[PDB]
Amino acid sequence: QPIFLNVLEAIEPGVVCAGHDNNQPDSFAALLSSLNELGERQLVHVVKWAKALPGFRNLHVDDQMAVIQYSWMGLMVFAMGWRSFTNVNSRMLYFAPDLVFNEYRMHKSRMYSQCVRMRHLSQEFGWLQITPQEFLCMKALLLFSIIPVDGLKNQKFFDELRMNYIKELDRIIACKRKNPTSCSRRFYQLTKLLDSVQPIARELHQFTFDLLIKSHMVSVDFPEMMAEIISVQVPKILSGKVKPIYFHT
Template identity: 50%
Template sequence: IQCVICGDEASGCHYGVLTCGSCKVFFKRAVEGHHSYLCAGRNDCIVDKIRRKNSHLLDFLLHRLKRYGALKALGLVPSLMFQSHLAMSSDNQALNPMPCRVGICEVQLNQQIVGILENIEPEDVHSGYDNPQPDVPHLLLSTLNHLCEKQLLSIVKWSKALPGFRNLHINDQMTLIQYSWMNLMVFSLGWRSFQNVSSEFLYIAPDLVLNQDQMRRSPIYELCMAIQLIPQEFAKLQVTREEFLCMKAIILLNTVPLEGLKSQAAFEEMRQSYIHELTKVIHMKEKGVVASSQRFYHLTKLLDSIHEIVKKVNLYCLSTFLQAETMRVEFPAMMSEVIASQLPKVLAGMVRPLLFHTK
């Protein structure tokens, strides 16, 4: 991963931005020293890992951050970390809002979509957890938080490759990821469990599989019980791989801010395209109209249920975050910023889940 300022290798997320150690020093001086920096040139200087040490170029760094939309009165906007990852493409297409129609048909032929979804599906991420005692709360929770950050990066990369997504306004891309990342993680966790283990287990990662006894002794027992409903529904409905892939794409497009999106019309068309794609793969399994309609009903009921399950996860996550120091639970930088900036909005009802069915 590169520093978004000079292009050198990033050492981490510093002050909300993925940067190298050298640029981090500048941020520290700028934020803690309350200095007002101006570009010494014409705001078109080249900043790289060789020139970054020049004093006048250090002054320019702040201007570059402002040009990225990263700073607001020396307070970093949390969503920049997503912008930096969304920008990591050869043509930087994600940074340029594109006022165009984004129906799947215009991106690829419909019959190719499921194949694309299969090709871009992320590989399982290892947790690095090596403690056989999941009832040690801070160790397990810290591991889960670090795993979530890895999975969040995978979600950003996956969303960039999702047909139609990069054509949305860049702000909409970041908003959709920020509001759906937990839903996507929980849904994918349910699928991994359905595919790899029996109903008595949760397949959190290849190196972190919890059985019933381990769940019961863990600090997240109630959450595990709620999440287990997902693989149970997968098993009950015998959900196909193609259906899962389409449903996952819909989940990315299933939570929006109350005020709507900048490219609202394009978003709605894209969402309807993936819903249509789901109906197509349903018809591959159920030939009759009645049977297909019933299956669509059950699969969309499952999609709706994800919101309630994730709400419980979000509540626990925010509660743990607020007590992190007391509980000795580690939260990586990116996770901390996402949780602090987005979860309160979600839990306060400032976002709208797009439901298929009325309760």
């Protein structure tokens, strides 16, 4: 029974630092350059994590890369939200041990409204008493929550994979529950929570896209993979060619 959960717990990424100089004065360029670097570093971990997920290899190679490239933002925000909840009870955004955002940095980063939503998401982990197991399963499901409207190379293997991950999330809920009405209510809350991640990720997508375009003008550096994915994949999302899969309407 614990087979699926054993795996998710086993492959969960450890701590990742951003390499931020917390002894230097906060500035838009410094903060954003550190966040971009952190994205580059976490992307490497997301790639190795995803590749180890049950059944991930069933997907066509090109789709494997695709889902990672479309979902990285939501995945990273979700996990960051969890770190914040567990490390500082959502009081600040715990991006990395060396990059913790307080209200001041939220303002200097010029993405205060987005940070607020992320902190709100972080608060939900508490307001809903999300278990470490529900967290893991929901995070896995977020990798299979955004695809092009024209479908993937092999849409069939993906649908099968997404369906099984929904089944696993349903299994976890029905675990310490014998009441079918309680399970339905918990599933409703979790799916609602999962959906709330997409609007936040889209705001970050728009923001990083605009920032990439004018990076040379604000002294903000974008690592190589980030620059590539944000100029090639993110636009497909912003233009509506690639869309999130919502549980509710």
